[PDB]
Amino acid sequence: MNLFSSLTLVTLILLTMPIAAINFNTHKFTNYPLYVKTTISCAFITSMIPTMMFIHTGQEMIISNWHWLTIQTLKLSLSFKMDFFSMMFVPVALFVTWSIMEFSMWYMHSDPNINQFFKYLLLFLITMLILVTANNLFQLFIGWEGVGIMSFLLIGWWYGRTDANTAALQAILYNRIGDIGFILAMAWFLINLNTWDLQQIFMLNPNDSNLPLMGLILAATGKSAQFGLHPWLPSAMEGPTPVSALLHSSTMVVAGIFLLIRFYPLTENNKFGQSIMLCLGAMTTLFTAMCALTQNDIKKIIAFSTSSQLGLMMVTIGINQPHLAFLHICTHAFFKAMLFMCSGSIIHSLNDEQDIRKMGGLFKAMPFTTTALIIGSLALTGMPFLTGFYSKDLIIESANTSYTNAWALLMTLVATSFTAIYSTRIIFFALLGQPRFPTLININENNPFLINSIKRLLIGSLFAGFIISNNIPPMTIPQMTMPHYLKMTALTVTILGFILALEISNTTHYLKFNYPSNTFKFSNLLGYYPTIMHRLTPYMNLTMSQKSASSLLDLIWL
């Protein structure tokens, strides 16, 4: 026992020690990014021991170590919940962050605020492991708002640029609309259950839990970019590449999904919450994957990829399979962080070129980047026995064989095909064909930082699904009996997506010029949703914030 809780707290204190180092500085640093990367490597090594001794016995515990407040019946203590979710998320998050920082020591080398960048990225990591280890709603709200604010500060990293500040304020807006529902859930549990602690919520086990679960679904909508509150995740590609790699693909954006996986004993006894999660997840995984088909910025395409995977996570929560959703989080982190890292390696090699229509011929120019991008795309689509096979296919193997919304299943399959479509679209326009980038080739990737940082997540994207899924215990019963047209569903739909998009890509070499269709104009302008509501809802606010609020009432009449 004395090993588990000790190294659990040592991981978090070790992550906080470079924040004290960067705040207690007088000299100019002897490579402070290397210091933070070494610290997070050792924090990974430290958190490996509680994970291994959890896989040995199933040892979960709670560390309610510091009494903080007592509001008359509510003892808010500093309480860390070490369960299956923390024991599988903390090594994956530390491993991904360690690869992102060895990536950033190459990519962000020209930035004179590199110490501020690594400081902010460590602050994000601290707030995120506050989020995923919290035992009450208040400490989880601390980590929740912390990853929201570090999202603000890392989107608006180039703070002189107007679009970065605009996207950062946009992300804060949609996350606070999710925070309306999170505070609704906290309010409901405090009034009806007298607690913010998870244990008393789970032990009391309320039955009229539609309203707190609607609050939690609105919170996951604001946080995991579900439909209605989605466009900030494509807008948030205006930040740097390791920001979009770590935060907005693999670590922050799974926290609404993690919030709903965390409250699984309430969702497993509320069919209405499961149905709403299933419908919203299927809507998001349709819409964002459809928008990804007709984009040309590679960071936008991989952001729509990760939001479609978040919608699929919401789907597999909505079929009452939360542990498969969390296995898909731990799986998805590796190859999606690696896809953003390889895309940004292309971007930095091609002198800040992000548009895929000026790329190509990079199969033999950037060989390691091409190899890892193909491996990440095939792990995304569901190639057999890569890491993305060990969760996502099982998701389909439980989405077919369950009492399910049928249209949600059909849109889930259309999303599964669209994943293959935009993956081979990225490989077509960025790796295949003949070059389209300008004439002064500065293409290079031979830094051990970049190569080792993509290499360790490559080892993850090859072996981690097998290793984790053979190291996690059963928490449901895997539905393993189905007809052969139903077992071969996800693979056949994925290969049909590959065939359809290869025919689409080979219609582009033809010497014909067609007028744009309405489907192309719809999917290219993002379902017309960021074009209308980003103009209309500010307008109807701000005129109402000036004409009647300031001028008419609160300067003349009142």
């Binding site: 004179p112 180039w158 703070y159 002189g160 640029r161 107007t162 679009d163 205006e238 984009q295 040309n296 910025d297 960071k299 800040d352 070129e353 992000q354 548009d355 229509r357 000026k358 326009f429 064909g433 003949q434 389209r436 582009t508 070499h509 033809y510 010497l511 010029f513 007028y515 744009p516 192309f520 104009k521 290219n524 302008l525």
Partner: protein
């Protein structure tokens, strides 16, 4: 429309700008290079069909429905260059573009860290302040009554003088600090 020197766009400028925007939006439509180059010569032929049109009212109408053609056939997200406005790297380093006068607010312990730089900056500022009144009295006798008509400035006429309104154009920050 809105320009610093001219108050309008000439018809020749309108034709060239519409040709350029048509080719750029076409290259956005027509990703591959040989395919775009084929359609680019086809579109060059379409623009050179009515290059020799003498009637400016008929050329005005042809330009107007050419704008309608370009608007009907435009790409929704055309290729913007990264440091072009609307690009992904546009105005990215503007947070690093510190104005030069902030060097005047440094402490002398860090001004002494770069002695040759500030020792030369003193005579740069000396040059500016003995150029200023000469270029003001240059501009006050050349500007017509009612103020200047166009925003363009005259150059340095005498030998030894400097061109007027020059300090912020010369001492502007680098585009990659």
């Amino acid at each position: 429309a809105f320009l610093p020197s001219a108050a309008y766009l000439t018809h020749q400028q309108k034709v060239l700008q519409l040709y350029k925007r048509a080719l750029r939006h076409l290259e956005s439509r027509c990703v591959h290079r040989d395919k775009y180059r084929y359609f680019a010569c086809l579109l060059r032929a379409r623009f050179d069909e009515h290059k020799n049109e003498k009637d400016m009212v008929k050329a005005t109408q042809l330009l107007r429905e050419a704008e309608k053609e370009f608007w009907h056939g435009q790409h929704p997200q055309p290729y913007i260059f990264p440091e072009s406005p609307g690009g992904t790297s546009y105005e990215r380093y503007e947070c690093y573009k510190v104005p030069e006068w902030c060097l005047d607010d440094w402490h002398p312990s860090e001004k002494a860290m770069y002695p040759d730089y500030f020792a030369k900056r003193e005579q740069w500022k000396k040059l500016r302040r003995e150029s200023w009144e000469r270029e003001v009295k240059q501009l006050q006798e050349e500007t017509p009554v009612g103020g200047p008509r166009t925003e363009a400035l005259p150059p340095a006429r005498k030998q030894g003088d400097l061109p007027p309104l020059w300090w912020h154009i010369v001492t502007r920050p680098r585009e990659r600090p």
